[PDB]
Design a protein around this ligand. Structure first.
Ligand code: 8DG
Ligand SMILES: OC[C@H]1O[C@@](CO)(O[C@H]2O[C@H](CO)[C@@H](O)[C@H](O)[C@H]2O)[C@@H](O)[C@@H]1O
Ligand code: MN
Ligand code: NA
Length: 129
């Protein structure tokens, strides 16, 4: 199975809400809620990838962010390594820049069952902040 490195951004506003998008029906992890992000490309770093991915997907440039968690997860047909960056400062206003559903969701209300199973420990850890 293929192996992927994925960088994602946990976009947290001052009201303890996270900007969450919903994956397309024909995507891997179809219809799941997700932190915006995507594949780290050859020649770019995990830090550069989360910036580029958030610019492409939601129209913001994250800045002064931190690595919240890094973990590996084995899906039925692929192995991924996820870099979860906590993004508390950014330029712009996040939106569905690729036409995808996005909205702000209270951290306390997040349901890990709505996200890919790889996100379980991250969602739990976020709720302890
Ligand atoms: N974006 C994102 N992906 C996640 C999360 N949790 C999780 O297991 N994944 C998995 C689902 C996918 O297998 C992979 C993310 O790839 P992606 O489909 O977002 O990649 P991408 O935007 O670069 O896709 P592409 O169209 O550029 O090829 O990581 C998450 O919170 N956010
Ligand atoms: O790896 C993130 C980690 O590095 C620090 C500096 O110790 O921040 C640097 O890296 C971030 C990610 O590229 C930048 O956004 C930031 O501006 C830079 O100082 C820590 O703040 C952070 O935990
Ligand atoms: Mn993506
Ligand atoms: Na991508």
């Amino acid at each position: 199975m293929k192996k992927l490195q994925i960088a994602v951004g946990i976009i947290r506003n001052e009201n303890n809400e996270i900007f969450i998008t919903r994956r397309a029906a024909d995507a891997h992890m179809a219809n799941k809620l997700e932190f915006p992000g995507g594949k780290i490309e050859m020649g770019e770093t995990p830090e550069q990838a989360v910036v580029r991915e958030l610019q492409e997907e939601v129209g913001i440039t994250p800045q002064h962010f931190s690595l919240f968690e890094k973990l590996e997860y084995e899906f039925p047909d692929r192995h991924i390594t996820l870099w979860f960056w906590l993004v508390e400062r950014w330029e712009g206003e996040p939106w569905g820049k690729e036409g995808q559903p996005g909205e702000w969701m209270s951290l306390v209300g997040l349901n890990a069952d709505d996200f890919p199973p790889a996100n379980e420990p991250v969602i739990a850890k976020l709720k302890r902040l």
